[PDB]
């Protein structure tokens, strides 16, 4: 109980910043996460015995893929931590508990292939879940891990609070389906602009949590240029593998996934920053002012991609 996690001075300082990189030492990631749970939630939120067993079962059910891996899980959770810490008073005890656990679990058992590839392959998961295929799978896997003996980190919630937090984690994980993001942000954009946005309305909170999940999920574009640039290699390595597998099914993939069209990556990044990233962190900054540093970092990285195209790197 009186057992805190402590990080070295540089990590203790930099972990509080939105652009923190969790580093290349896999064995430190679990303690980094427990550290974030303790500061954000409390040392009491979770039985440390059961949290540590949950954290390790989650790690084991992430696969060895270039990008949708255990590092990504902890990275997305760190971005959620940074939002929760800069927005102390806006979130319930149940929301802070749920959202860190949601972020850690959001891509469980990812195989490194989009919903689109599962559908055309006619993968069994596409038969069980017609929309948000992988995201319904990630939540399924989260529930299964919570039901292993000794792994129910929520066991000291009342029946109602337990049902509330699983509902938070389910909407949070489904919202990481980027297909659902455009709609969610347009609605949040209208609601903010006509002044009808109301954080006491549960359906409004759900939308705002959804956008936080998209913001944390995309946080690779909010890092310092060299992390952003080196993460892009891992992102495209999965995409080009999927593109290869599309060709094996006799389907020309979209250029984003065609390793023969690497030359168009910088121009594709521009579209993506302009179409998804900048709009995402703009509406987030409007609803939650202290998350501005994510919008600033995103715009710096847009400028770095403009320079790549202009040949200056
Ligand atoms: C941060 O997350 C992402 C990052 C960094 N990048 C991307 C890729 S965005 C994107 N759209 C593209 C279109 C293209 C292309 C590369 C492209 N990259 O080559 C020719 O036509 C995604 C989809 C996510 C989700
Ligand atoms: Mg996902
Ligand atoms: Zn993700």
Domain membership of residue 51 (yes or no) is: yes
1 domain residue, yes or no:
no
Around Cβ 89, how many Cβ atoms within 10 Å? 4
User: Distance, CA 102 to ligand 3 centroid (Å)?
Assistant: 11
Experimental method: X-ray
107 is in an annotated binding site: yes
What is the spatial distance between Cα 8 and Cα 4, in angstroms, rounded to a whole number? 13
**Closest-approaching ligand to the CA atom of 261:** 1
Tell me, yes or no, whether 77 lies in a domain: yes
> For position 92, which CATH number holds?
1.10.1300.10
The answer to whether position 15 is within a domain reads: no
Q: Which of 135, 290, 139 is nearest to 214 (CA)?
A: 135
Domain of 135, in residue numbers: 28-310
Closest-approaching ligand to the CA atom of 114? 2
- Identify the CA nearest to 65 among candidates 256, 238, 243, 259: 238
Domain membership flag for residue 128: yes
Q: Strand, coil or helix: what is 110?
A: coil
Residue 251 in domain: yes
Into how many domains does the chain fold?
1
Question: 255 CB under 6 A from ligand 1?
Answer: yes
Distance CA 88, CA 199 (A): 14
CA 104 remoteness from chain centre: 8
CA–CA dist 208, 214 (Å, integer): 10
**8 Å CB contact between 117 and 245:** yes
Q: How far apart are CA 218 and CA 149, in angstroms?
A: 33
- Which among 229, 228, 262 has a CA at the least distance from the CA of 243? 262
Q: Is 206 annotated as a binding residue?
A: no
List the Cα angle 13/102/35 in 5-degree steps.
30
Q: Rounded to the nearest whole angstrom, what is the distance from the C-alpha of residue 160 to the centroid of ligand 1?
A: 41
Q: Is 268 in the pocket of ligand 1 (CB under 6 A)?
A: yes
Dump strand ranges (E) for 122-257: none
Rg of the chain in Å (alpha carbons): 19
Q: Is 72 annotated as a binding residue?
A: yes
8 Å CB contact between 143 and 97: no
Query: How many C-beta atoms lie closer than 10 Å to residue 186's C-beta?
Result: 12
Tell me if residue 277 falls in helix, strand or coil. helix
Instruction: Identify whether 53 is part of a domain.
Output: yes
Q: Annotated active-site positions, please?
A: 68
User: Is 7 among the domain residues?
Assistant: no
């Amino acid at each position: 109980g009186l057992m805190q996690f402590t990080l070295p001075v540089r990590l203790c300082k930099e972990i509080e910043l939105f652009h923190f990189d969790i580093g290349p030492f896999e064995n430190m990631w679990p303690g980094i996460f427990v550290y974030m749970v303790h500061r954000s939630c409390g040392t009491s939120c979770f039985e440390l015995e059961k949290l540590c067993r949950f954290i390790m079962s989650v790690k084991k059910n992430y696969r060895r893929v270039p990008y949708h891996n255990w590092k990504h899980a902890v990275t997305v959770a760190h971005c959620m931590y940074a939002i929760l810490q800069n927005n102390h008073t806006l979130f319930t005890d149940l929301e802070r508990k749920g959202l860190l656990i949601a972020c850690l679990c959001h891509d469980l058992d990812h195989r490194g292939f989009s919903n689109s590839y599962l559908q055309k392959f006619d993968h069994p998961l596409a038969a069980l879940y017609s929309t948000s295929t992988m995201e319904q799978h990630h939540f399924s896997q989260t529930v299964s891990i919570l039901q292993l003996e000794g792994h129910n980190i929520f066991s000291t919630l009342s029946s109602s609070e337990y049902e509330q937090v699983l509902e938070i984690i389910r909407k949070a994980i489904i919202a990481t389906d980027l297909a659902l993001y455009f709609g969610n942000r347009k609605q949040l954009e209208e609601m903010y602009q006509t002044g009808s946005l109301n954080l006491n309305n549960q359906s409004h909170r759900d939308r705002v949590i959804g956008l936080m999940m998209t913001a944390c999920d995309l946080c690779s574009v909010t890092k310092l240029w060299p992390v952003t640039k080196l993460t892009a290699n891992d992102i495209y390595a999965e995409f080009w593998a999927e593109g290869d597998e599309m060709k094996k099914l006799g389907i020309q993939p979209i250029p984003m996934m065609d390793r023969d069209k690497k030359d168009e990556v910088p121009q594709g990044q521009l579209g993506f920053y302009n179409a998804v990233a900048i709009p995402c962190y703009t509406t987030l900054t409007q609803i939650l002012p202290p998350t501005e540093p994510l919008l600033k970092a995103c715009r710096d990285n847009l400028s770095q991609w403009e320079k790549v195209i202009r040949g200056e790197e």
